[PDB]
Design a protein around this ligand. Structure first.
Ligand SMILES: C[C@@H](Nc1nc2c(cnn2C2CCCC2)c(=O)[nH]1)C(=O)N1CC2(CC(F)C2)C1
Ligand SMILES: [Mg+2]
Ligand SMILES: [Zn+2]
Length: 316
């Protein structure tokens, strides 16, 4: 049971996601489907929405970074986007259905070891998936295995041609959050931004991919108090793989090695050449983004460059 107060905070990217527990994030997600009217426009049985979210919650794992709270941030930031950019004037409700759900489903059953560990260690997932985005294929699988158990099927009133359309949107969105395709997606998105056209099904599909990627690496857009502890979760998880990679003799990535990474190098380059330049492109479509999201990103940036200029000196 949420308050009037909480329900005005739910719609804003300043929302402190650390203050709630699974019970309340679940009610927070459920509020979103009513509030955006998908509940009404696809005839979602409200007890289906509640069980399904409980199966979506159950199938995340206890990992420092990619846990259920991370699922919440992505969907809550995608939530915030829709109000901020008035995405209902631009996007169909089925698209809204695709953005919100995929966000919730995009890291299902994430193991805590990323893509290049599954391939190097030659794991079930990377052999199941042929070295093609092993993790993101699995997420989208577990998403629809849940959806294929009738009790959790928030989709069970939707005509089959309509399922097709959602399932394919969702697949594209989830499969695009793999950071091994960052540059290729960004480049085709600016290949359509040169003259963007909202009636074009291919311009819109690239906007949804840019949208979900944004919400997925959006931890720094949040105010400093919310954003900062999420760095330690990330490093705790990255040291966990680089710790394990060395015990087995697999290679290690320098940004993941604890002999190399400090909190500041961890975020400087990432903010400067992924977050800002992406959110810079979206700002061309929705100019309000520069105020609300680019400005936090800038401030975190100056700060984290400065923290680095502190530690360099300590090392002297
Ligand atoms: C240490 C890290 N930092 C970093 N990652 C973040 C933040 C939020 N979500 N992620 C995701 C990016 C991929 C999975 C986690 C975040 O605030 N910082 C960093 O240096 N990058 C460069 C890359 C390698 C891949 F190509 C992107 C990670
Ligand atoms: Mg992921
Ligand atoms: Zn993610």
């Amino acid at each position: 049971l949420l308050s009037p107060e909480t329900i005005e905070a739910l719609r804003k990217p300043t929302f402190d996601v650390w203050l709630w527990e699974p019970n309340e994030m679940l009610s927070c997600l459920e509020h979103m489907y009513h509030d955006l009217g998908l509940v009404r426009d696809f005839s979602i049985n409200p007890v289906t929405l509640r069980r399904w979210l409980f199966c979506v919650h159950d199938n995340y794992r206890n990992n420092p970074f990619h846990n259920f709270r991370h699922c919440f941030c992505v969907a809550q930031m995608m939530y915030s986007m829709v109000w901020l950019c008035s995405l209902q004037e631009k996007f169909s409700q089925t698209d809204i259905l695709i953005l919100m759900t995929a966000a919730i489903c995009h890291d299902l059953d994430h193991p805590g070891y990323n893509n290049t560990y599954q391939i190097n260690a030659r794991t079930e997932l990377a052999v199941r998936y042929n070295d093609i985005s092993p993790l993101e294929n699995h997420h989208c699988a577990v998403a629809f295995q849940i959806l294929a158990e009738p009790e959790c099927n928030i989709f069970s009133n939707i005509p089959p041609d309509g399922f097709k359309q959602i399932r394919q949107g969702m697949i594209t969105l989830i499969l695009a959050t793999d950071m091994a395709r960052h540059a290729e997606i960004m480049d085709s998105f600016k290949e359509k931004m040169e003259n963007f056209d909202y009636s074009n099904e291919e311009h819109m599909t690239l906007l949804k991919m840019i949208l979900i990627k944004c919400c997925d690496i959006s931890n720094e857009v949040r105010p400093m108090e919310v954003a900062e502890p999420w760095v330690d979760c990330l490093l705790e998880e990255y040291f966990m793989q680089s710790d394990r990679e060395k015990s087995e003799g697999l290679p290690v990535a320098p940004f993941m090695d604890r002999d190399k990474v400090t909190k500041a190098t961890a975020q400087i380059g990432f903010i400067k050449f992924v977050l800002i330049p992406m959110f810079e492109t979206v700002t061309k479509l929705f100019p309000m983004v520069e105020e609300i999201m680019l400005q936090p990103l800038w401030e975190s940036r100056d700060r984290y460059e400065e923290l680095k200029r502190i530690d360099d000196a300590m090392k002297e």
